[PDB]
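Model the whole thing, not chain by chain.
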Amino acid sequence: FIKDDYGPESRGFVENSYLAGLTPTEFFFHAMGGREGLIDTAVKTAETGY
DNA sequence: GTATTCGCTCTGCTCCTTCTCCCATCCTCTCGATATGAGATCAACTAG
């Protein structure tokens, strides 16, 4: 991306469906979001269990 | 003789420092590391 690109593509809007398939940038941004979910799931457990 | 201070003490108030505590449950597997006898004392015999 160009510098200072606040457009939807650049900042992680996946304009495709799962049937259409994600583009490589959409794939990476989606992996980032899913990683957030995985970290939350793996980090909340200790602190909720305590 | 009372102002007036004034030195000194008594808390007491924030704050910074220390220190001590805690950090889900359960389960499977692999892998590495991790002396000896002589003399003395005593007590049980073991008989005289």
